[PDB]
């Protein structure tokens, strides 16, 4: 199990093996809504709620579900 960093600035990715520690995403819009995409202060939480935030903390446990840069060559 693993959970990327909180997204301070240099996304390096950290561990998160305390049992309950998914990777949440603090964003306001995401998907081209300014310049640096948008707010996405990642982090690690023990609960994976779900609803219609329209702008709040997302969730996704398992492991390394908050990478962000999943761009493949080509």
């Amino acid at each position: 199990i693993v959970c990327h960093t909180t997204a301070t600035s240099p996304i390096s990715a950290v561990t998160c093996p305390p049992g309950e520690n998914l990777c949440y995403r603090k964003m306001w819009c995401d998907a081209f809504c300014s310049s640096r995409g948008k707010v996405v202060e990642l982090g690690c939480a023990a609960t994976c709620p779900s609803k219609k935030p329209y702008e709040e903390v997302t969730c996704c446990s398992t492991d390394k579900c908050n990478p962000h840069p999943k761009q493949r060559p080509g």
Binding site: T6, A7, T8, S9, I11, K26, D30, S34, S35, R36, G37, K38, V39, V40, E41, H68, P69
Partner: peptide, 19 residues
């Protein structure tokens, strides 16, 4: 006069997100 360089993060590199 810079007086706010600690707000939040963005998609990856918006050190100063707000503006």
């Amino acid at each position: 006069i810079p007086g706010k360089r600690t707000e939040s993060f963005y998609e990856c590199c918006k050190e100063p997100y707000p503006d």
